[PDB]
Amino acid sequence: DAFFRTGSFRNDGLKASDVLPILKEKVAFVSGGRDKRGGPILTFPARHDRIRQEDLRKLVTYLASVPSEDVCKRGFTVIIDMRGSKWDLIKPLLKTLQEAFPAEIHVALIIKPSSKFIFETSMVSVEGLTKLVDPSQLTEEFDGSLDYNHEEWIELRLSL
């Protein structure tokens, strides 16, 4: 406590440059898409290289700060694509969000290939997503029409 910083990254003023390697890996992204309530969408697309827990905590802390304060106030819709994956590879993402995500999670929607978290979780089909999110607000992976270029987004964030 005299040399090393420990605990939450909430007040560390993380920038895209602080999380650049994991941003490039596209473990998670904030497309700009909004759910039907007006809340922001945080996406974890289909992943096998093990990631460092601290890198994931920094990533979700940074991504929580991406939407405007008013949009964030409605809480996030988290979309996790589990198609071609397993529960043992999804549960650690939910645990890290519960421990490190500095904003409210309204609901975590898991695309089916249970509910012991502080936020609501729902096992849904890629079509069941459209009940809570308009397809114009969903990216390509979920048969949506929202244009989102992750590499371009990173370059614009680095210019902030």
Numbering used by the authors: 19 to 65, 68 to 133, 146 to 192
Which sentences from the paper describe this structure?
The neuronal RhoGEF Kalirin, a central regulator of cytoskeletal dynamics, contains a Sec14 domain (KalbSec14) followed by multiple spectrin-like repeats and catalytic domains. The N-terminal CRAL_TRIO domain of Kalirin is followed by nine SRs and a variable number of RhoGEF (consisting of DH and PH domains), SH3 and protein kinase domains. Kal7, the major isoform expressed in the adult brain, supports the formation and function of excitatory synapses. KalbSec14 adopts a closed conformation, sealing off the canonical ligand entry site, and instead employs a surface groove to bind a limited set of lysophospholipids.
The asymmetric unit contains eight nearly identical protein monomers, with an overall root mean square deviation (rmsd) of 0.8 Å for 175 Cα atoms. An N-terminal 10-amino-acid extension (residues 18–27) upstream of the H1 helix projects ~18 Å away from the αβα core, confirming the notion that the Sec14 domain of Kalirin lacks the CRAL_TRIO_N domain found in many stand-alone Sec14 proteins. As such, the interaction of the C-terminal H9 helix, which is part of the first SR, with the central αβα fold buries 441 Å2 of solvent-accessible surface area. Unexpectedly, KalbSec14 has only several small, discontinuous hydrophobic pockets (~100 Å3 each) in the center of its αβα fold, none of which is large enough to accommodate even a single phospholipid molecule. Our NMR CSP data and mutagenesis studies demonstrate that the residues lining a distinct surface groove of the Kalirin Sec14 domain are responsible for its interaction with selected detergents and LPC lipids.
